[PDB]
Design a protein around this motif. Structure first.
Motif, PDB file in Angstrom:
ATOM      1  N   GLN A 159      46.594  44.725  37.360  1.00 38.30           N
ATOM      2  CA  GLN A 159      45.298  45.229  36.847  1.00 38.30           C
ATOM      3  C   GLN A 159      45.108  46.342  36.632  1.00 38.30           C
TER       4      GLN A 159
ATOM      5  N   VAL B  52      45.121  37.318  39.727  1.00 39.03           N
ATOM      6  CA  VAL B  52      45.003  38.379  39.146  1.00 39.03           C
ATOM      7  C   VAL B  52      44.105  39.277  40.628  1.00 39.03           C
ATOM      8  N   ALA B  53      44.063  40.326  41.320  1.00 34.14           N
ATOM      9  CA  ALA B  53      42.581  40.788  42.113  1.00 34.14           C
ATOM     10  C   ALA B  53      42.195  41.879  40.822  1.00 34.14           C
ATOM     11  N   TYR B  54      41.245  41.459  40.957  1.00 32.18           N
ATOM     12  CA  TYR B  54      40.427  42.046  39.176  1.00 32.18           C
ATOM     13  C   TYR B  54      38.984  42.972  40.358  1.00 32.18           C
ATOM     14  N   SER B  55      38.668  44.433  40.363  1.00 31.39           N
ATOM     15  CA  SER B  55      37.457  44.581  40.874  1.00 31.39           C
ATOM     16  C   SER B  55      37.132  45.953  39.513  1.00 31.39           C
ATOM     17  N   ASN B  56      36.269  46.698  39.934  1.00 30.61           N
ATOM     18  CA  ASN B  56      35.884  48.008  38.867  1.00 30.61           C
ATOM     19  C   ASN B  56      35.925  49.215  39.382  1.00 30.61           C
ATOM     20  N   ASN B  57      36.810  49.315  40.020  1.00 33.05           N
ATOM     21  CA  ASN B  57      37.818  50.548  39.955  1.00 33.05           C
ATOM     22  C   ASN B  57      39.270  49.856  41.731  1.00 33.05           C
ATOM     23  N   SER B  58      39.691  49.611  40.785  1.00 33.29           N
ATOM     24  CA  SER B  58      41.283  49.351  41.051  1.00 33.29           C
ATOM     25  C   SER B  58      42.126  49.484  40.230  1.00 33.29           C
ATOM     26  N   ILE B  59      42.778  49.778  40.534  1.00 35.70           N
ATOM     27  CA  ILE B  59      44.698  49.984  39.338  1.00 35.70           C
ATOM     28  C   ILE B  59      45.866  49.655  39.845  1.00 35.70           C
ATOM     29  N   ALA B  60      46.726  49.612  39.612  1.00 32.61           N
ATOM     30  CA  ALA B  60      48.109  49.235  40.101  1.00 32.61           C
ATOM     31  C   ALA B  60      48.985  50.149  39.080  1.00 32.61           C
ATOM     32  N   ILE B  61      49.921  51.019  39.397  1.00 36.88           N
ATOM     33  CA  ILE B  61      50.691  51.874  38.943  1.00 36.88           C
ATOM     34  C   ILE B  61      51.907  51.750  39.308  1.00 36.88           C
ATOM     35  N   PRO B  62      53.413  51.803  38.589  1.00 36.62           N
ATOM     36  CA  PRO B  62      54.823  50.801  39.087  1.00 36.62           C
ATOM     37  C   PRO B  62      55.197  52.615  39.984  1.00 36.62           C
ATOM     38  N   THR B  63      56.219  52.474  40.356  1.00 39.65           N
ATOM     39  CA  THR B  63      56.692  53.097  41.103  1.00 39.65           C
ATOM     40  C   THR B  63      58.221  53.414  40.863  1.00 39.65           C
ATOM     41  N   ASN B  64      59.278  52.937  40.710  1.00 45.92           N
ATOM     42  CA  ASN B  64      60.268  52.125  40.188  1.00 45.92           C
ATOM     43  C   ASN B  64      61.078  51.862  38.945  1.00 45.92           C
TER      44      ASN B  64
ATOM     45  N   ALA C 111      58.774  48.261  38.013  1.00 42.53           N
ATOM     46  CA  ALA C 111      59.132  47.622  39.155  1.00 42.53           C
ATOM     47  C   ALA C 111      58.428  48.098  40.351  1.00 42.53           C
ATOM     48  N   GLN C 112      57.768  47.739  41.850  1.00 42.78           N
ATOM     49  CA  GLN C 112      57.638  48.228  42.791  1.00 42.78           C
ATOM     50  C   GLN C 112      55.969  48.996  42.459  1.00 42.78           C
ATOM     51  N   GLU C 113      55.458  48.367  42.060  1.00 44.94           N
ATOM     52  CA  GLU C 113      53.787  48.903  41.898  1.00 44.94           C
ATOM     53  C   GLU C 113      53.026  49.335  42.592  1.00 44.94           C
ATOM     54  N   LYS C 114      51.616  49.552  43.246  1.00 47.06           N
ATOM     55  CA  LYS C 114      51.110  50.402  44.206  1.00 47.06           C
ATOM     56  C   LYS C 114      49.815  49.894  43.479  1.00 47.06           C
ATOM     57  N   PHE C 116      45.847  51.307  43.423  1.00 47.98           N
ATOM     58  CA  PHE C 116      44.823  52.785  43.718  1.00 47.98           C
ATOM     59  C   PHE C 116      43.702  52.362  43.253  1.00 47.98           C
ATOM     60  N   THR C 118      40.099  54.683  41.183  1.00 49.36           N
ATOM     61  CA  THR C 118      40.064  55.303  40.143  1.00 49.36           C
ATOM     62  C   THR C 118      39.063  55.311  39.640  1.00 49.36           C
TER      63      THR C 118
END
Ligand SMILES: *[C@@H]1O[C@H](CO)[C@@H](O[C@@H]2O[C@H](CO)[C@@H](O)[C@H](O)[C@H]2NC(C)=O)[C@H](O)[C@H]1NC(C)=O
Ligand SMILES: *[C@@H]1O[C@H](CO)[C@@H](O[C@@H]2O[C@H](CO)[C@@H](O)[C@H](O)[C@H]2NC(C)=O)[C@H](O)[C@H]1NC(C)=O
Ligand SMILES: *[C@@H]1O[C@H](CO)[C@@H](O[C@@H]2O[C@H](CO)[C@@H](O)[C@H](O)[C@H]2NC(C)=O)[C@H](O)[C@H]1NC(C)=O
Ligand SMILES: *[C@@H]1O[C@H](CO)[C@@H](O[C@@H]2O[C@H](CO)[C@@H](O)[C@H](O)[C@H]2NC(C)=O)[C@H](O)[C@H]1NC(C)=O
Ligand SMILES: *[C@@H]1O[C@H](CO)[C@@H](O[C@@H]2O[C@H](CO)[C@@H](O)[C@H](O)[C@H]2NC(C)=O)[C@H](O)[C@H]1NC(C)=O
Ligand SMILES: *[C@@H]1O[C@H](CO)[C@@H](O[C@@H]2O[C@H](CO)[C@@H](O)[C@H](O)[C@H]2NC(C)=O)[C@H](O)[C@H]1NC(C)=O
Ligand SMILES: *[C@@H]1O[C@H](CO)[C@@H](O[C@@H]2O[C@H](CO)[C@@H](O)[C@H](O)[C@H]2NC(C)=O)[C@H](O)[C@H]1NC(C)=O
Ligand code: NAG
Ligand code: NAG
Lengths: 411, 66, 188
Positions: A159, B52-64, C111-114, C116, C118
């Motif tokens: 998102q 999908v969770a949608y809002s004003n101030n949310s993001i999703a970032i990968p870690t692998n 993969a393996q999202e998190k 946050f 912003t």
């Protein structure tokens, strides 16, 4: 901000032909005589079946590109952009949108022509996917692109707010994000006005869907000529064969029957060949449409005049009878002004070249600005680099460069 | 048994209320398969359902990566 | 195979072979049967040639697509979406096969999202700050700047941010601190 419409055909109409009824009608003698010509109908059935499965393959390749079906959340705020006309409308039973309904309505006792053609051995088969499934695919693609961005075309859907997505796209085309962050309201108003103009054009103009209508007309004309070919003598006494059998003896009736059989078989062969050529062209168009869907909807394209006229920003898909429609959102400059430039600045006996922008002058002073927007700034050492002395470059000019460190030394 | 689909009439197949990926396409969104020791005709399933969770101030970032 | 099997048809003649037709009828009459057989066989062979031409055209289209794929995916790196595989393209390898080519595509997939929180800009000292080539994130207490496609938090500084205008026009701006790496060494 401009919105443009593109129409691409995808599939065709599946048809099946019965040899015996078309050729010999309901006469048993012709049915017995037909067996002498060998295997002339298994080939026809094979070709028609190949075309029929090809059409379903085309539709599946074009539309089925997402593994999961997404839904938009109940809250409908996307940074000021409306989107209420392209999103599904739950009120109507078809689960479609306003533009989709307009597009479907745009393209269209006594006995119907379909029944009359069916009573002569020519039938139409139904497609594998109904309109509801195509609508659901379109809705899933729209929800994915609105909520996630281009991340769902290469992995999981992540998102992101819409304004930040627009900032990323602006950075992609070559403009900094502050332009969007300071003109959000104007950009949203322009987008809404463009969507309204598209609504008005679709509601008023009725000649924007030429290609699908041409496909339908070509199929109808082919069927019409195939049916009309049944009433020609081919050099015999009459078209109707029972009169031929009753009037005169078998020795010449055999010749008349052979003439009719040869003519009708030739007509069927010609029909099949034309159908094959048309199917090949439709498959080429479907491949182009699938490539466009993968390149303009699930990402941003740097190709020129591919996903619209101008600088591409994004795109939206919609369905249409035997085809697809693309709405392209693009960026075009306006209100240009003249300026005087130089290739480099010679200061302290050294040549200075800009890092990202271009040098401009308004008559007395000198500034550095970005390429696609007027935003002057003072020439410093943070946005300039030095390479060699200033006696080689042609057209160099004299000016001064500001160092942000010496002021701090004395203060 | 007898079943009436928009492509005609189907005899010998039993209709079920579940949904699977298509095996043998019949038409009008109806497919058939051999499962259970029997033949079952069903309606196609486009895929899994997601939100999908949608809002004003949310993001999703990968870690692998893979 | 079907072209071979067509040879047993009669096409309205008295026999499917020529020698018995020529050995049973006088020259004035065998002509009609010979003409029927010849016309039928010519039509069959012509139909075969036409179908071969159409299939050849399709094979040519496929070969052109394969040549373009070899030119772009293998000899270089492609930015086109879903052209040289699913994901982000890294590279590719060719292999041969009977009447065809096989492409092995090596690609990158996150993969393996998190989750946050912003904000678009940071208001500091009455000025708005924007990231250069990253994105602002927060873990509930502090703020950081990280690259888009991988998690690598960093401290907000002047070197990785740029300033434009006041902080009373951008929607969603938040208050925080931007660290200046010139004064601490100057005051030491
Ligand atoms: C989005 O577009 C819809 C439709 O164009 C807008 O709804 C209209 O709102 C005005 C006044 O707000 C009414 O006079 C019209 O009758 C409405 N039309 C329809 C079809 O409902 C809507 O206001 C726009 N903006 C938002 C945020 O939804
Ligand atoms: C930039 O300069 C050019 C040339 O001086 C301008 O082009 C002329 O514009 C005048 C109008 O003021 C016309 O009468 C001339 O016919 C134009 N010349 C040619 C060759 O077309 C141009 O208008 C200037 N740019 C802007 C934005 O005004
Ligand atoms: C070119 O741009 C400069 C900006 O540096 C203009 O100079 C300014 O003019 C205004 C007049 O309204 C003054 O109030 C400012 O003090 C000037 N700036 C400086 C730094 O002195 C200039 O007028 C513009 N036009 C020309 C022809 O030079
Ligand atoms: C830019 O400034 C330099 C400063 O050195 C100029 O170079 C000298 O200019 C004077 C004035 O015309 C000449 O008498 C000298 O001979 C120049 N020195 C050299 C080494 O050539 C330079 O001319 C200036 N740029 C322009 C376009 O005049
Ligand atoms: C990214 O994923 C890889 C495997 O896909 C992780 O590597 C494994 O990590 C676990 C837990 O740390 C170890 O027990 C394994 O020995 C590692 N190797 C394998 C082959 O499983 C890696 O740790 C992940 N990245 C991060 C930052 O956790
Ligand atoms: C958010 O990130 C900050 C930065 O790392 C975390 O602060 C550190 O937390 C660790 C946890 O043991 C401490 O050892 C450090 O001393 C902390 N550093 C500072 C400068 O305070 C913080 O804990 C994170 N918040 C959450 C909820 O995990
Ligand atoms: C960031 O700090 C500024 C002050 O530097 C805040 O502005 C104040 O807002 C309150 C309203 O809650 C006003 O009563 C004050 O007068 C404002 N101060 C000034 C100097 O104008 C601003 O609200 C802060 N940002 C956030 C998100 O709270
Ligand atoms: C935050 O989201 C809510 C809906 O969840 C919306 O009403 C509000 O306008 C949003 N705030 C901003 C600043 O966009
Ligand atoms: C982010 O929050 C949403 C809210 O329910 C949740 O569904 C999602 O799983 C969260 N993401 C991660 C990576 O945990």
């Amino acid at each position: 901000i401009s919105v443009t419409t593109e129409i691409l055909p995808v599939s065709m109409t599946k048809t099946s032909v019965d040899c015996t009824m078309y050729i010999c009608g309901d006469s048993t003698e012709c049915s017995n005589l037909l067996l002498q010509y060998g295997s002339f109908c298994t080939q026809l059935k094979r070709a028609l079946t190949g075309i029929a499965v090809e059409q379903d393959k085309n539709t599946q390749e074009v539309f089925a590109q997402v593994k999961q079906i997404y839904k938009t959340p109940p809250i409908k705020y996307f940074g000021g952009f409306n989107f209420s006309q392209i999103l599904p409308d739950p009120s109507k039973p078809s689960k479609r949108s306003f533009i989709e309904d307009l597009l479907f309505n745009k393209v269209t006792a006594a006995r119907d022509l379909i029944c009359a053609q069916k009573f002569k051995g020519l039938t139409v088969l139904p497609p594998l996917l109904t309109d509801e499934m195509i609508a659901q695919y379109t809705s899933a693609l729209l929800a994915g692109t609105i909520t996630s961005g281009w991340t769902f075309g290469a992995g999981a859907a992540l998102q992101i707010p819409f304004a930040m997505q627009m900032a990323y796209r602006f950075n992609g085309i070559g403009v900094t994000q502050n332009v969007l962050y300071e003109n959000q309201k104007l950009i949203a108003n322009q987008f809404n006005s463009a969507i309204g103009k598209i609504q008005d054009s679709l509601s008023s103009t009725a000649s924007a869907l030429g290609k699908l209508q041409d496909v339908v007309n070509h199929n109808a004309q082919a069927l019409n000529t195939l049916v009309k070919q049944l009433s020609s003598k081919f050099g015999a006494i009459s078209s109707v064969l029972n009169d031929i059998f009753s009037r005169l003896d078998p020795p010449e009736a055999e010749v008349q029957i052979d003439r009719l059989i040869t003519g009708r078989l030739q007509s069927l062969q010609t029909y099949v060949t034309q159908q094959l050529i048309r199917a090949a062209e439709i498959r080429a168009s479907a491949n182009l449409a699938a490539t466009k869907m993968s390149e303009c909807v699930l990402g941003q394209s740097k190709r020129v005049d591919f996903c619209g006229k101008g600088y591409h920003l994004m795109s939206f898909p919609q369905s249409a009878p035997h085809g697809v429609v693309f709405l392209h959102v693009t960026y075009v400059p306006a209100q240009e002004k003249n300026f005087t430039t130089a290739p480099a600045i010679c200061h302290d006996g050294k040549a200075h070249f800009p890092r990202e922008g271009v040098f401009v002058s308004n008559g007395t002073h000198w500034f550095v600005t970005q390429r696609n927007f007027y935003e002057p700034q003072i020439i410093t050492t943070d946005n300039t680099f030095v390479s060699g002395n200033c006696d080689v470059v042609i057209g160099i000019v004299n000016n001064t460069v500001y160092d942000p460190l010496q002021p701090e030394l004395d203060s | 048994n007898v079943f009436q689909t928009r492509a005609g009439c189907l005899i010998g197949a039993e209709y079920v209320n579940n949904s699977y990926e298509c095996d043998i396409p019949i038409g009008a969104g109806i497919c058939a398969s051999y499962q259970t020791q029997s033949i079952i005709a069903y309606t196609m399933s486009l895929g899994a359902e997601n939100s999908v969770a949608y809002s004003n101030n949310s993001i999703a970032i990968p870690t692998n990566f893979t």
